[PDB]
Amino acid sequence: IHRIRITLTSRNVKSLEKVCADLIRGAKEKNLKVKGPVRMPTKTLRITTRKTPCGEGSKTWDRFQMRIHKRLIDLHSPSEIVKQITSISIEPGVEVEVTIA
Amino acid sequence: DIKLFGKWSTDDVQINDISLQDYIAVKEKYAKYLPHSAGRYAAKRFRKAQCPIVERLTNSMMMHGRNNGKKLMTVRIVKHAFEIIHLLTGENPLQVLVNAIINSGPREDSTRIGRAGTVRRQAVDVSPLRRVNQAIWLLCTGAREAAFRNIKTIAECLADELINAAKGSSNSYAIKKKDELERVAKSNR
Amino acid sequence: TEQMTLRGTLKGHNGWVTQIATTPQFPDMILSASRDKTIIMWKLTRDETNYGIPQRALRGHSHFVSDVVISSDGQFALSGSWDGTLRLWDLTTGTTTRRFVGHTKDVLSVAFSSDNRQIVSGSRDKTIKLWNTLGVCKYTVQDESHSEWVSCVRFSPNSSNPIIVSCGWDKLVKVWNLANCKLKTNHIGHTGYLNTVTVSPDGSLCASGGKDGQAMLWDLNEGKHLYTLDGGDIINALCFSPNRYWLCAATGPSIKIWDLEGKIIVDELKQEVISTSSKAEPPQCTSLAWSADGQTLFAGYTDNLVRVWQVTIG
Amino acid sequence: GRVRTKTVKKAARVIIEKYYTRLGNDFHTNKRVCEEIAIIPSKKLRNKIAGYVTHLMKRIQRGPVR
Amino acid sequence: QSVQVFGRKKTATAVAHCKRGNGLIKVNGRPLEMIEPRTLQYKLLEPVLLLGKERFAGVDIRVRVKGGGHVAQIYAIRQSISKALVAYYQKYVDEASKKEIKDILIQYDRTLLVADPRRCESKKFGGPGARARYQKSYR
Amino acid sequence: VTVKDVNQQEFVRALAAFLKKSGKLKVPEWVDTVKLAKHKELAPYDENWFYTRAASTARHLYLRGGAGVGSMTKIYGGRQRNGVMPSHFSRGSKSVARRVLQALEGLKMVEKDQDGGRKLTPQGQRDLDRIAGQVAAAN
Amino acid sequence: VQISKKRKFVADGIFKAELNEFLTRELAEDGYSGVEVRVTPTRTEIIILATRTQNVLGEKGRRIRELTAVVQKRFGFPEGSVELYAEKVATRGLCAIAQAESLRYKLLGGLAVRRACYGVLRFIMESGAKGCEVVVSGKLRGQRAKSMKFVDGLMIHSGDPVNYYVDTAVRHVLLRQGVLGIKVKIMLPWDPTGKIGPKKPLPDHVSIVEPKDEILPTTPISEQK
RNA sequence: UGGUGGAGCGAUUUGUCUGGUUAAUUCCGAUAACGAACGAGACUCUGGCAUGCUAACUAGUUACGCGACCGGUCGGCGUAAC
Structure with missing residues (x-):
């Protein structure tokens, strides 16, 4: 029951905000002590490569960005309740990692 | 009251010609403690007219490749120069600066109308802003150039240049170039 | 005999003066809201050089603060803003005491109960919100509340059955009961969206005005039409004189002061002597407030100026 | 320079001749009613329409717009 | 009893904490006169000379500076001090006194209250800087 | 009066003079010969540089705690000029920083931290704050 | 030991990409449209969207549990x-990849380029697309490379909307003379609140409700309640 | 750049324009054309503002306690309002 934390990590913002909000309101209605979403610095993966395969042109470059948005929600609740509240909330395009102490 | 480097007053300074009276800023409402303002005075047209003339001097001082963004050093060059000026002549340096810019500004320039290779120029009038621009540019190039490879420093070279320029001495680079530009306008007409 | 004269013009706010609020307790203190997201408290020095001086400015209401009102004691203040939240201010120090966070869209009007224990607030939500003192939402009415926006909501100050009045942009002036929240009257006279509804100082007459520019008088005791007062342009504000027994509305560039036994033109307030900005449209009068003693009128204009109109008796 | 495109013009016009009685002279009221009136794609587009609606509502009193 | 505001230039940020006291002036625990770029010492003395020490009498301000470069920090701290004073003379004094301060500060230099918004522009491929391009050789 | 209240240039010269006068600072055998970094072209001009470096090191360790040999090597770094190759940031000498910290440990002015770094001792804080006292007194 | 979030999200990207490439080269003949992968620590599910599922399952669901044994043995x-x-x-008409594959396998049937491409246009416009663009390039006739573009309805080329309003497919057809390139571009319908097409309208479209x-x-008159 | 209409046996042309106006075939207004479609614009990402909102021992401040050194300095440590 002690200090389970839940790390929600995704590339989409909307889906991550929706699922995390659902976990929070799902926990709040049960009268459980919850520490709110801790938004960490957004990880931006940059790749800059030549457009051309051959290498004859005006030396143009692509700029490929990949965004990683990470949220932490913390609970002071029993593991039995934590298991089912973590079980019910599934979404394609979010990764959830639960840790205790 | 407000005094330049907290030791030079801006009330005892006096403008000669009415033409430049609204194109040399140094006066009651433009009185600043340091040249260094970091304003947006080159944002649009006729905004640099409201730039303090001391700031225009120290900005046009950091010109050549090695000193492009080395303002903090031009401010102390101008500070030392102003002290040298006061020691040599006796009176307010800001008056000497204004006198130098008043004298140094070319009144009639020559414009290119024709083809390239051949020289054919029409003599035309110079705007009060362009007079101030060329005056500052000529003073700095004279200072710079004069002290490039010899022992006297930039500070006392700038002082010497402004002493000569203010009292219209033939030795000043700025006076020689003005004289030549007006003589070329006189040659065309 | 009794004509209005411009005594001075307080200049503080930097935007449209949306609402002015006064109290009988403090006669040297008025509280005016504006479109610079600021509510300024005035010290009425009544000097020759200027009538008032900016004293304290409440800040933090993000978007335009539309309505402002203060309690019976000169200690609290309530406001409703376009950010969609109400703020209850501590007037002494000038800090927010409580935040009501319920509405969705822009809050247009708020009202303070006579006993100072109940709050009613109208928005663009198509709903009225009943808040209590501590600040939790009590009752959100959605039983055909309004088809369009709710422009003005007010209380009826009397010892009789306490009732609230609510006009909207659906042409309806609707009357609710607190603790019951059912309709007694839905009045249908106007032809145009409504801006203001004001109750009498006694608490017997209701005055509704808007785009139509024809102020219509009802009676709360029966629920029937009495008069149709024919105004000029759009009515921005109605207010009853607490002593003189007059009705003062707001035409766009002028303020009309009228008698209720004569039904005649008593006065016309227009301040335009210079013709420098005569090519442009005149500056609109938005807010109307009365002084403590009911001898003076406070007019809020869209040119960022609050004017005082002193009744010069002979 | 900045010229209002056929999109904001067309939209603004049909808004006037549908909800003339709803609109007035103030930009912010027209901006707020334009949200409720039309399903509009973005804030900028709504601001530009609200602005040109304001501009038309000025000159409608001056004379009859074609 | 106290207020806390930030002055910002480029990526420099200087947060001034203003409380009541004996006219104390400290930035990162150091006096103004002991700040490293002494050439621009007057730029820090701008707000205190313009208003006069008498206004600072009943005010202790503690400034902390982070990010940016030397001169940017100087513009952040000198902005922060003035914004802190006007914020304090807004909250715990009449608005008239705040106006009497504001008008003087704005009339001298608008930079003291309003932040310079421009930032270091993004660099593009095909050149060394944001505008400049590499040398283009014909034959 | 505190180290932060005085000028940080004069303070080092005063503390260096104190460290010389004490006459119990273990100077290495190679002070006359060795440079002070990878990127310096000549040996330092002043004969008593070890005392000024020791003084500087103590002052740095006063201003923030938990400073190792690597940090001290990062403090006294500068611009390596590589002839025709462009100039890059080069770090200081590790030995000089280590011998200075060893020599100051010798005075019981600095001691090792449980966390891993080196902090100034209350004896050190006394000496440094005293030196600041008379440096302030000399104006 | 576990890998970083950055490497993990990349790894999932390559997994998706390689799986797609494998599935395309396997189920091209059965009009493989797309794939959807949902991952659960209990068991990860892979969902194949194809034109004719009866075929991809195989005789009594034989081929599906060859494909299962492959990905298990490999990854x-x-x-x-x-x-x-x-x-x-849901609708095979509004899938660029499916129509591109169909056009490829009817061209391999030895049909004229005009009739085949027009057949695909007629079907895509019948299915209910806003507009279609079918391009075929290479040795169409003779020894010189040529290109034939066929367009119908509305088709947008610039801005963000292109990303989520038009879907495209690029396919290589092997013929005895050489190789032909098929480019199929389909603009979808508004489809409010649906799976067919995008939810948000085009950002230059203004919808105004009719006054009552x-x-x-x-x-x-005052009605009493 | 089509559709239908107009002008030429025809290739073709008009629409797609005299004149103002815009960064813009961008608009206004003329009008044998009228209705449209792509590009432009809209759009998406990024900079600049919020002492308003939701939050935070993997971010900090303010206050208090204890300590080190002379009411002051601390990126010396531990709790509470945010």
Whole structure:
């Protein structure tokens, strides 16, 4: 029951905000002590490569960005309740990692 | 009251010609403690007219490749120069600066109308802003150039240049170039 | 005999003066809201050089603060803003005491109960919100509340059955009961969206005005039409004189002061002597407030100026 | 320079001749009613329409717009 | 009893904490006169000379500076001090006194209250800087 | 009066003079010969540089705690000029920083931290704050 | 030991990409439209969207549990952690890839380029697309490379909307003379609140609700409740 | 750049324009054309503002306690309002 934390990590913002909000309101209605979403610095993966395969042109470059948005929600609740509240909330395009102490 | 480097007053300074009276800023409402303002005075047209003339001097001082963004050093060059000026002549340096810019500004320039290779120029009038621009540019190039490879420093070279320029001495680079530009306008007409 | 004269013009706010609020307790203190997201408290020095001086400015209401009102004691203040939240201010120090966070869209009007224990607030939500003192939402009415926006909501100050009045942009002036929240009257006279509804100082007459520019008088005791007062342009504000027994509305560039036994033109307030900005449209009068003693009128204009109109008796 | 495109013009016009009685002279009221009136794609587009609606509502009193 | 505001230039940020006291002036625990770029010492003395020490009498301000470069920090701290004073003379004094301060500060230099918004522009491929391009050789 | 209240240039010269006068600072055998970094072209001009470096090191360790040999090597770094190759940031000498910290440990002015770094001792804080006292007194 | 979030999200990207490339080269003949992968620590499910599922399953669901044994043997996750599901495509007309594959396998049937491409246009416009663009390039006739573009309805080229309003497919057809390039571009319908097409409208579109005819009252009357 | 209409046996042309106006075939207004479609614009990402909102021992401040050194300095440590 002690200090389970839940790390929600995704590339989409909307889906991550929706699922995390659902976990929070799902926990709040049960009268459980919850520490709110801790938004960490957004990880931006940059790749800059030549457009051309051959290498004859005006030396143009692509700029490929990949965004990683990470949220932490913390609970002071029993593991039995934590298991089912973590079980019910599934979404394609979010990764959830639960840790205790 | 407000005094330049907290030791030079801006009330005892006096403008000669009415033409430049609204194109040399140094006066009651433009009185600043340091040249260094970091304003947006080159944002649009006729905004640099409201730039303090001391700031225009120290900005046009950091010109050549090695000193492009080395303002903090031009401010102390101008500070030392102003002290040298006061020691040599006796009176307010800001008056000497204004006198130098008043004298140094070319009144009639020559414009290119024709083809390239051949020289054919029409003599035309110079705007009060362009007079101030060329005056500052000529003073700095004279200072710079004069002290490039010899022992006297930039500070006392700038002082010497402004002493000569203010009292219209033939030795000043700025006076020689003005004289030549007006003589070329006189040659065309 | 009794004509209005411009005594001075307080200049503080930097935007449209949306609402002015006064109290009988403090006669040297008025509280005016504006479109610079600021509510300024005035010290009425009544000097020759200027009538008032900016004293304290409440800040933090993000978007335009539309309505402002203060309690019976000169200690609290309530406001409703376009950010969609109400703020209850501590007037002494000038800090927010409580935040009501319920509405969705822009809050247009708020009202303070006579006993100072109940709050009613109208928005663009198509709903009225009943808040209590501590600040939790009590009752959100959605039983055909309004088809369009709710422009003005007010209380009826009397010892009789306490009732609230609510006009909207659906042409309806609707009357609710607190603790019951059912309709007694839905009045249908106007032809145009409504801006203001004001109750009498006694608490017997209701005055509704808007785009139509024809102020219509009802009676709360029966629920029937009495008069149709024919105004000029759009009515921005109605207010009853607490002593003189007059009705003062707001035409766009002028303020009309009228008698209720004569039904005649008593006065016309227009301040335009210079013709420098005569090519442009005149500056609109938005807010109307009365002084403590009911001898003076406070007019809020869209040119960022609050004017005082002193009744010069002979 | 900045010229209002056929999109904001067309939209603004049909808004006037549908909800003339709803609109007035103030930009912010027209901006707020334009949200409720039309399903509009973005804030900028709504601001530009609200602005040109304001501009038309000025000159409608001056004379009859074609 | 106290207020806390930030002055910002480029990526420099200087947060001034203003409380009541004996006219104390400290930035990162150091006096103004002991700040490293002494050439621009007057730029820090701008707000205190313009208003006069008498206004600072009943005010202790503690400034902390982070990010940016030397001169940017100087513009952040000198902005922060003035914004802190006007914020304090807004909250715990009449608005008239705040106006009497504001008008003087704005009339001298608008930079003291309003932040310079421009930032270091993004660099593009095909050149060394944001505008400049590499040398283009014909034959 | 505190180290932060005085000028940080004069303070080092005063503390260096104190460290010389004490006459119990273990100077290495190679002070006359060795440079002070990878990127310096000549040996330092002043004969008593070890005392000024020791003084500087103590002052740095006063201003923030938990400073190792690597940090001290990062403090006294500068611009390596590589002839025709462009100039890059080069770090200081590790030995000089280590011998200075060893020599100051010798005075019981600095001691090792449980966390891993080196902090100034209350004896050190006394000496440094005293030196600041008379440096302030000399104006 | 576990890998970083950055490397993990990349790894999932390559997994998706390689799986797609494998599935395309396997189920091209059965009009493989797309794939959807949902991952659960209990067991990860792979969902294949193809034109004719009856075929991709195989004789009594034989081929599906060849494909299952492949991905299990290859990627190295444990057996009983994957079930390859084959769901039917909602509308095969508004899938660029499906139409591109159909055009490729009817061209391999030895049909004229004009009739084949027009057949695909007619079907895509019949299915209910906003507009279609079919391009075929290479040795169409003779020894010189040529290109034939065929367009119908509305087709947008610039801005963000292109990303989520038009879907494209690029396919290589092997002929005896050489190789032909098929480019199929389909603009979808508004489809509010649906799976067919995008939810948000185009950002240059302004929809205005019709006013209700309000009867203006002349005589004042007050209805009592 | 089509559709239908107009002008030429025809290739073709008009629409797609005299004149103002815009960064813009961008608009206004003329009008044998009228209705449209792509590009432009809209759009998406990024900079600049919020002492308003939701939050935070993997971010900090303010206050208090204890300590080190002379009411002051601390990126010396531990709790509470945010």
